[PDB]
Design a protein around this ligand. Structure first.
Ligand SMILES: *[C@@](C)(CO)[C@](*)(O)[C@H](Cc1ccccc1)NC(=O)[C@H](Cc1ccc(OC)cc1)NC(=O)[C@H](C)NC(=O)CN1CCOCC1
Ligand SMILES: *[C@@](C)(CO)[C@](*)(O)[C@H](Cc1ccccc1)NC(=O)[C@H](Cc1ccc(OC)cc1)NC(=O)[C@H](C)NC(=O)CN1CCOCC1
Ligand SMILES: *[C@@](C)(CO)[C@](*)(O)[C@H](Cc1ccccc1)NC(=O)[C@H](Cc1ccc(OC)cc1)NC(=O)[C@H](C)NC(=O)CN1CCOCC1
Ligand SMILES: *[C@@](C)(CO)[C@](*)(O)[C@H](Cc1ccccc1)NC(=O)[C@H](Cc1ccc(OC)cc1)NC(=O)[C@H](C)NC(=O)CN1CCOCC1
Ligand SMILES: [Mg+2]
Ligand SMILES: [Mg+2]
Ligand SMILES: [Mg+2]
Ligand SMILES: [Mg+2]
Lengths: 204, 212, 222, 222, 196, 233, 195, 195, 196
């Protein structure tokens, strides 16, 4: 009965040269029982990508909530929300539930369409923004992801190289965690193209 | 864990996974969960790693002492009862074991004994033990017949571990197969789930829940 | 955390380390613990990270509205009063431990606030898990009538004590100097004594190493 | 109520080559958020080309190493100076650990050396005596950070041959002592970055047929 | 804390140590526990720093608003406002407050308000953790209608002992003198009081 | 299973070029009550070792008796008791460390933190720590309780690693220790002004200093401090 | 309550739900129908806390029926499942949450596709080829992993379902008194009477 | 373990005992014989804590068999029951008591009478015409109160027993996988294979 | 309890109140807390009545057996036997004992033994629940080498205050004078000491 580790899951984000990558596993379980191998944890609102780990009902709820808020934003502002602004919106929304929080570990990823700068950010369940040049990790195998990213990562990787680094970070972290795995998805994000790749990984 | 062993026309199949866990941390993927007590005797391990590891190798020492003293290989019944009487002395102390003593002798024939840490000792044809026992039972029961061939029985044991390895989060790594005949036990290899799953999926057409 | 505040001749200086932890894990190696309430009133925060950020922004927002309403530059005591009354109202559940400092028409000021809503006054203060390592240095080297450059040295030395000796503190030293009659200068990463050494090996993989099942173009446009 | 256990932090790492084996460990010793020692070795030469480390609760760790060192001594007295093989040492340690099954030694134990065919050997134990020979094992506070990296770089897990459609795995091969030490140094610097209980220094004990060599490297002290 | 307030011929004097603790760590060794709620009405604070602070601020606000409408409040009135807050919120407060003030009609007055929120008017009052060690001493040595110098010595010697035995007390001895003449702040350092 | 009653606070120490310095205040606390003021918490063993003890005082007095008895026992049938076969610091430590761990293992610990400072027969500095849990460690600077949090940071500025030991004189080392004792008096609520200090040098031997006082304290700035925020008077 | 299963095949969704209602050491009823028709082509089975289950099922039923009358239109299974999930997602942070797990089997008439949704009491929704709640999954999932194919007929799906019930009847500790089976397809909802 | 029944009739004692061995959410075995022959005309069924049951049964069996060999004589059911009760009466104040309930069915050859003894883990002995341990009694006792007569035959006793098993199979929550029935009479102990 | 022992010029004096409580009920108002373990070695008992009694009896037995073999024991020896019992049985004892005795070589000596079982040799000692209220007073008023009459007044005034503030203390003030002259018992009633 620890909300953040009932369903399981992981998300990792990385920056490269004029690009960003965000990746997640596909597992949704109920403790030991694996239930679904199609549960994607990465969503997007325009060009801003949001990955969410933790309690799956809140993952779904927050996605629906941020879709709601970004849609109204776009109607009133007459433009797509940027990653820096969306990051602030996530933080506000999470802290609003300070003493009854969503048990989640969100990760924002995207490229600012005006400046062209790659941007990633992480949060705790309660809204604290964790900005990073290099990488953000989240989920039940965050320790594993920290160890993989900290050793494997190097700055200014090309999109094709960055794909290999983030994929190897996720896969090997997932295989040391019982509640993570069962498939994986990687998003490579350039200024005006986004490639989505499903990884082959061990299914245990 | 997921461990099984079943009796059939051609003897006994014994199959186990190879994962060790400490909470949600995957401690190992290459653990031996079958211990070869003697050429005609096997023991499966589920529960606390050391409790099984320590006391089943100790069991092997007691079986060796029996055949030195009695000039005859120990019966599966007597072997299992040494272990069950031992753990019963420790009942309440907190030992965690789910074991299966498998073997062939002349007087008994192929025999399987379930022995656990609360002192239960049961003779039987089919047992699945471990956190993923229910997943193994599902596949094993629905495909089991007494008249299975040695080839088909080996596969069913392998496929049942794979089923559990897939669904149970605390089972996986690789499958270790064993076949016990009148002549003794025969090892039928280590099978990594990493390759075995996709190989089984493709060839069998099963596991349609999974993104191919 | 480790955070300090030191008064000097013509103003006040505050400093902080840049480590954020989750149990024994370093979540952020270069987080910003120095917070702007108003242009010349800054806050160093220890405790629950979100709480220190949220409470500093809320009071900072209300201070700005108050400054506009009164047509006056905001005072440190106003921020102090608003912060402590907010924190007291929540009976410690908002885990913000703050060192509040700044210059205003009244002069230069240095205060600390605890989560339950108690405030202190002092010439030198330290809060956070590394406050004992910092206070040991402050008690050893502090004196009356410090200069600007002496106070920055003392402050950063007190933060360094925390960085090296406290496991809850690490990485870099942020500083903010608030002098009377001048603009407050925020010195982000004033010291960086924990640069990662060159790695022994490049872990750049040969392209194609990762096995892939599917590919697809994602539509981000309308 | 008196709590007989404590956590002294740190982390250890054992890798085995073709004709050698390394057992590495950081030299930091901690309690809670304080550093007790920046150089307190916990990897020991136990004789007969067996190196050992028991990481976790240092009092239990030292007690165990002390008992095993003594076990080696009496093995010589009782069996005509016969060399204690690494597999025999492993089994002996299981009995030492399980002897206190109901009041355990709070330690992850790793031993390294050469098997009776001269090939590198690493054995790892849980706190109560379960053991297993492996090519690779990280133990201690940062085990969860380091171990997945070792799976990837030592055993080449999740790495496929480029262009083979993820069908042919990257073939297993022994690493040179130069390559292994690179991985050890990178593992510990990465662990030091993200784990607060890991740092100060790294001491590696290398075991070949010629004996036991040592190497020391500085780690970040924050 | 060790705190006390003592009435005398010309008025009343408040006294306090300067130690604030978080466990066995001294968070502040130069604390000012003597606080102004009105020109010549002051209080000594013991118990929770946050609670006593929040109370004193509310009282200061109430007395400032009282003064705007009805002129200078009595010391009894100030004690009544303290009581009202402490009594009605007894379940959520850990505050032991001594109220001391100077009127021209009533001269020096001391009211003590313990944990429950009861009010007790006394010639002199002692409170805080360190007060336990000086009940014997203060009772034997207190006299009514003392001089300023005698009362300062009485408080200095008393708090000196309280500080000596109580680990939760220490630092400097602050005092505040309340008379017709005005308000005088006094401070006394360890090197003086320790060797009394 | 115990709870400590009468307790002693920080014991601090460090190595310098020719030997070791150790210090501890003379207070026996009874909870918040500062009960006993004449308590010596540094206990010399021979002319080459000083054992500094914090924690429970009844257990400290028991350890005193054990060390006293160890000296007696070592002298038995030992013509070289005052020469080659005299008690070394390393022998005294290992004995205590053994006892501490055995007692914790019987769930009946000696509720202490102990620092054994001394000089070996070959001139090497000895400084090692042991506590109720049987946990042992060594470092150029060692301290117990609040000393670990406040003294160590100050003492590590003088001797930050091994190579800094030859570069540190007894004057510099004692100055740091005496400074650390002052800081502990400012900030530790269970410390006293009076303390003892011991120097074990490889040339000048054991120097035991009693009835030292913390001095040169900064309190003057307290007069300027008023209220807790808005108060101007 | 206890056992509820669901299998989506080529042209239909099949829901099996246990008939037993137990309370203490007594099986009070052995013919209980743990399902409600939300709309002509949408069926919801349910299991969980006593009282909560039926109260929640009927509350959803009323709302969907209200929608149907208001718009003169049937909501898609996907739309119904999203409505149900949100109600449970609200519930979990209420003073007293609904402790009800549901399966929603429906036939989307616009897509001409069967759809099966599994939603737990937390509001955790997943679309699946086959689903189960409670301990049932620990046997059936591995069994279906093996025997299930996506192109099966309704008759093949029923035989696959018989295999699951047989396994549960063999290895489950409790007697759940068989199952009521219902099929959802293009022609609506109908009950298999002989199972 | 769980269900053990006993019925004494005119000329015999009939013991019925459930075949299921459950552990967690799995029925590990469905053919378990929860009984031991203590002597040629004395049978003991048992139910209770895992491990304890068989360990206790076999320990008693060994002791009675030892007595038989030593004296070349069979102990009376009454004598065996008193021995068993005393062992349980000792046990209950031990460091770790045997948590085992037993029924002892025997035919006294000296009296030419069947005898049924019910003994719980506390060492509470009663001679009865019909007995049960655990939750079984809550159904069977009232049923036997109604249908039992003291002069019934073994065949009538078996039909009476079928009535009990049917009631348990209808109202008990758990599947106990039927019963093994054994008859104790003047000719010794024999098992009914088709029940 | 309030108990104390004070050394002076001619020897040592022990002092104690006479109140024994079971909760807020006074089970005995005329208790004798000053007990003889040897001719001129006495002790004051605080804490559990049953524990201190059982200890004092064992000590008296040990010292009687010591005397039979080795002659008169020192006061230090008596304190050591008390310590040995209190320390080794610290988990099962609630005893705060002050040991006081007169040698001809060592004159008056006072050893206090708190809960832990530690030994502390002091010029004078105070103990028991009521001692807390007189730490301030006793420290300020104690002088070394006092006369008999001064020491009697010091103890009387001290215990008078301890009794006044501590509810767990009261009744009569018993004293025992230990000098070369012999052993003298003194008693002082409420009507005298209350109005000091
Ligand atoms: C699967 C993986 C589910 O755990 C199996 O049951 C597996 C069985 C097994 C048998 C032989 C060799 C390897 C693995 N069990 C484990 O891997 C076991 C899980 C478990 C942990 C603790 C338990 O105590 C109640 C029972 C089962 N894991 C371990 O034993 C791990 C390696 N060791 C520890 O967790 C150390 N603990 C053990 C208990 O004492 C304290 C230290
Ligand atoms: C040092 C690092 C303490 O170790 C500082 O106090 C630091 C302050 C800080 C950090 C970033 C920005 C501004 C200020 N505090 C932390 O890093 C803080 C440590 C902490 C963790 C848990 C706590 O629980 C009561 C209290 C303090 N870390 C965090 O706040 C992290 C980012 N978030 C969480 O651990 C999530 N918690 C927050 C509290 O509610 C439960 C979940
Ligand atoms: C002496 C030191 C001890 O009683 C005084 O009473 C002193 C009074 C004082 C101090 C500063 C300013 C004005 C008056 N009290 C304290 O220093 C006080 C000790 C105390 C804490 C909590 C209490 O119960 C709620 C009672 C007494 N110290 C504090 O309030 C410090 C600043 N904060 C903490 O210790 C944190 N507490 C908050 C309350 O919950 C427990 C943790
Ligand atoms: C004053 C009154 C309070 O401390 C003294 O210490 C006094 C000392 C004394 C009394 C008589 C004879 C010689 C010395 N102590 C008591 O009066 C004592 C109070 C006390 C009881 C229990 C304690 O912890 C075990 C500590 C102090 N009173 C008693 O022992 C009385 C006679 N008995 C009880 O209260 C019954 N107790 C027995 C112990 O368990 C709780 C119930
Ligand atoms: Mg799995
Ligand atoms: Mg640090
Ligand atoms: Mg007692
Ligand atoms: Mg009284």
């Amino acid at each position: 009965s620890d909300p953040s580790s009932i369903n399981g899951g992981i998300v990792v984000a990385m920056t490269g040269k004029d690009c960003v990558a965000i990746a997640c596993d596909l597992r949704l379980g109920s403790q030991s029982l694996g239930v679904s191998n199609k549960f994607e944890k990465i969503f997007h609102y325009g060009h801003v990508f949001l990955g969410i780990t933790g309690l799956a009902t809140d993952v779904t709820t927050l996605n629906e909530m941020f879709r709601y808020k970004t849609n109204l934003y776009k109607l009133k502002e007459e433009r797509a929300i940027e990653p820096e602004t969306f990051t602030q919106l996530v933080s506000s929304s999470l802290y609003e539930r300070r003493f009854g929080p969503y048990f989640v570990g969100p990760v924002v990823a995207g490229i600012n369409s005006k400046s062209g700068k790659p941007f990633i950010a992480g949060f705790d369940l309660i809204g604290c923004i964790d900005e990073a040049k290099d990488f953000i990790v989240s989920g039940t195998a965050s320790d594993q992801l920290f160890g993989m990213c900290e050793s494997l990562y190097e700055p200014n990787l090309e999109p094709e190289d960055l794909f290999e680094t983030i994929s190897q970070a996720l896969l090997n972290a997932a295989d040391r965690d019982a509640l993570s795995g069962w498939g994986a998805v990687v998003y490579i994000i350039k200024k005006d193209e986004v490639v989505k790749r499903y990884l082959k990984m061990r299914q245990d | 864990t997921t461990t099984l062993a079943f009796r059939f026309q051609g003897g006994i199949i014994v199959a186990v996974d190879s994962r060790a866990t400490a909470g949600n941390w995957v401690a190992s993927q290459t653990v031996k969960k079958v211990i070869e007590i003697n050429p005609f005797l096997l023991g499966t391990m589920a529960g606390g790693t050391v409790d099984c590891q320590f006391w089943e190798t100790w069991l092997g020492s007691q079986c060796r002492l029996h055949e030195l003293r009695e000039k005859e290989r120990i019966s599966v019944a007597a072997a299992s009862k040494i272990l069950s009487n031992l753990v019963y002395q420790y009942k309440g102390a907190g030992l965690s074991m789910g074991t299966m003593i498998c073997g062939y002798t002349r007087k008994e024939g192929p025999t399987i004994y379930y022995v656990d840490s609360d002192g239960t000792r049961l003779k039987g044809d089919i047992f699945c033990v471990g956190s993923g026992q229910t997943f193994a039972y599902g596949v094993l029961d629905s495909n089991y017949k007494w008249d299975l061939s040695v080839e088909d029985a080996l596969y069913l044991g392998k496929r049942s571990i794979l089923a559990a390895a897939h669904r149970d989060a605390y089972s996986g790594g690789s499958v270790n197969l064993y076949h016990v005949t009148e002549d003794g036990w025969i090892y039928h290899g280590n099978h990594d789930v990493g390759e075995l799953f996709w190989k089984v999926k493709e060839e069998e057409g099963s596991f349609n829940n999974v993104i191919g | 955390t480790t955070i300090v505040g030191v008064k000097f001749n013509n103003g006040v200086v505050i400093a902080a380390d840049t480590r954020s932890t989750q149990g024994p894990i370093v979540a952020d190696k270069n987080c910003a613990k120095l917070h702007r309430i108003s242009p010349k009133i800054w806050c160093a925060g220890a405790g629950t990270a979100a709480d220190t950020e949220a409470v500093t922004q809320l009071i900072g927002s209300n201070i700005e509205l108050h400054s506009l309403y009164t047509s006056r530059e905001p005072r440190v005591v106003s921020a102090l009063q608003m912060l402590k009354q907010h924190l007291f109202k929540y009976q410690g559940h908002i885990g913000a431990y703050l060192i509040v400092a700044g210059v205003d028409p009244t002069g230069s000021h240095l205060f600390s606030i605890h989560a339950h809503g108690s405030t202190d006054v002092g010439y030198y203060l330290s809060l956070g898990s590394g406050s004992l390592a910092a206070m040991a240095v402050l008690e050893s080297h502090w004196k009356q009538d410090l200069t600007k450059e002496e106070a920055i040295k003392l402050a950063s030395d007190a933060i360094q004590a925390g960085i090296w000796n406290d496991l809850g503190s690490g990485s870099n030293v942020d500083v903010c100097v608030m002098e009377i009659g001048k603009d407050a200068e925020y010195l982000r990463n004033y010291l960086t004594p924990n640069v990662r050494e060159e790695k022994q090996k490049s872990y750049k993989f040969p392209r194609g190493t990762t096995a892939v099942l599917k590919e697809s173009i994602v539509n981000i446009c309308d | 109520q008196f709590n007989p256990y404590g956590d002294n932090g740190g982390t250890i790492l054992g890798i085995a080559g073709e004709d050698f084996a390394v057992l590495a460990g950081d030299t930091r010793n901690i309690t809670d958020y304080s550093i007790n020692s920046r150089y307190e070795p916990k990897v020991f030469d136990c004789g007969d080309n067996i190196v050992m480390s028991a990481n976790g609760f240092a009092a239990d760790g030292d007690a165990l190493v002390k008992r095993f060192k003594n076990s080696v001594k009496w093995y010589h007295f009782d069996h005509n100076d016969k060399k204690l093989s690494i597999n025999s040492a492993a089994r002996n340690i299981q009995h030492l650990l399980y002897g206190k099954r109901f009041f355990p030694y709070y330690v992850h134990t790793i031993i390294a050396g050469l098997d009776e065919d001269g090939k590198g050997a690493v054995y790892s134990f849980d706190p109560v005596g379960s053991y297993e020979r492996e090519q690779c094992r990280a133990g201690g506070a940062a085990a969860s950070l380091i171990m997945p990296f070792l799976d990837n770089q030592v055993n080449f897990k999740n790495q496929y041959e480029p262009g083979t459609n993820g069908k042919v795995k990257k073939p297993l091969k022994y690493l040179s002592v130069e390559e292994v030490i690179k991985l050890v140094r990178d593992s510990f610097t990465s662990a030091t970055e993200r784990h607060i209980q890991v740092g100060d220094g790294l001491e590696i004990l290398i075991v070949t047929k010629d004996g036991v060599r040592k190497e020391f490297y500085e780690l970040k002290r924050d | 804390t060790s705190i006390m307030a003592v009435t005398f011929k010309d008025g009343v004097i408040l006294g306090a140590d300067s130690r604030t603790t978080t466990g066995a760590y001294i968070a502040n060794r130069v604390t000012d526990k003597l606080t102004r709620v009105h020109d010549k009405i002051w209080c000594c604070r013991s118990g929770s720093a946050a609670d006593t602070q929040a109370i004193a601020d509310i009282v200061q606000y109430h007395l400032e608003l009282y003064t705007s409408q009805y002129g200078t409040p009595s010391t009894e009135t100030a004690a009544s406002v303290f009581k009202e807050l402490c009594y009605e919120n007894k379940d959520n407060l850990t505050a032991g407050i001594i109220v001391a003030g100077y009127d021209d009609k009533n001269k020096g007055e001391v009211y003590t308000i313990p944990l429950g929120g009861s009010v007790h008017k006394l010639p002199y009052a002692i409170a805080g953790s360190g007060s336990t060690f000086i009940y014997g001493y203060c009772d034997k040595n207190f006299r009514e209608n003392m001089s300023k110098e005698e009362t300062v010595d009485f408080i200095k010697h008393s708090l000196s002992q309280a500080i000596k035995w109580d680990g939760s007390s220490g630092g400097v001895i602050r005092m505040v003198v309340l008379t017709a003449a005005g308000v005088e702040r006094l401070i006394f350092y360890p090197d003086e009081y320790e060797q009394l | 299973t115990q709870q400590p009653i009468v307790t002693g606070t920080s014991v601090i120490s460090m190595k310098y070029d020719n030997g070791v310095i150790i210090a501890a205040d003379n207070l026996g606390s009874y909870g918040s009550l500062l009960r006993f003021n004449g308590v010596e918490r540094l206990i010399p063993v021979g002319d080459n070792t000083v054992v500094g003890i914090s924690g429970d005082i009844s257990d400290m007095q028991h350890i005193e008796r054990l060390l006293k008895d160890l000296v007696t026992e070592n002298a038995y049938d030992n013509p070289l008791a005052d020469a080659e076969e005299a008690l070394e610091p390393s022998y005294i430590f290992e004995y205590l460390a053994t006892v501490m761990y055995q007692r914790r293992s019987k769930m009946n610990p000696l509720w202490n933190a102990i620092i054994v400072a001394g000089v070996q027969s070959n001139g090497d500095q000895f400084l090692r720590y042991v506590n109720l849990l049987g946990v042992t460690y060594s470092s150029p600077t060692l301290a117990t309780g609040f000393g670990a949090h406040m003294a160590n940071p100050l003492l590590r500025k003088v001797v930050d690693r091994e190579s800094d030991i030859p570069k540190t004189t007894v004057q510099v080392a004692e100055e740091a220790i005496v400074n650390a004792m002052r800081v502990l008096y400012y900030r530790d609520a269970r410390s006293s002004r009076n303390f003892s200090l011991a120097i074990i040098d490889k040339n000048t031997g054991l120097t035991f200093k009693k009835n030292l006082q913390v001095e040169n304290m900064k309190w003057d700035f307290a007069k300027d401090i008023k209220g807790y925020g808005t108060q101007k008077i | 309550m206890d056992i509820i299963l669901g299998i989506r095949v080529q042209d239909s969704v099949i829901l099996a739900s246990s008939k037993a209602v137990t309370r203490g050491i007594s099986v009070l009823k052995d013919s209980d129908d743990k399902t409600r028709q939300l709309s002509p082509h949408t069926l919801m089975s349910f299991a969980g806390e006593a009282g909560d289950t039926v109260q929640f099922a009927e509350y959803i039923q009323a709302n969907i029926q209200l929608y149907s009358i208001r718009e003169d239109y049937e909501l898609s299974p996907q739309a119904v499942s999203s409505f149900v999930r949100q109600e449970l997602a609200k519930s979990i942070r209420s003073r007293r949450p609904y402790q009800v797990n549901v399966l929603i089997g429906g036939y989307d008439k616009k897509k001409n596709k069967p759809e099966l949704y599994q939603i737990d009491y937390l509001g955790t929704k997943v679309e699946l080829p086959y689903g189960a709640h409670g301990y049932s999954g620990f046997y059936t999932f591995s069994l279906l992993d093996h025997h299930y194919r996506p192109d099966m007929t309704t008759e093949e799906g029923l035989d696959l379902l018989k295999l699951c019930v047989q396994e549960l009847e063999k290895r489950m500790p409790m007697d759940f008194k068989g199952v009521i089976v219902k099929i959802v397809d293009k022609d609506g909802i109908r009950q298999v009477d002989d199972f």
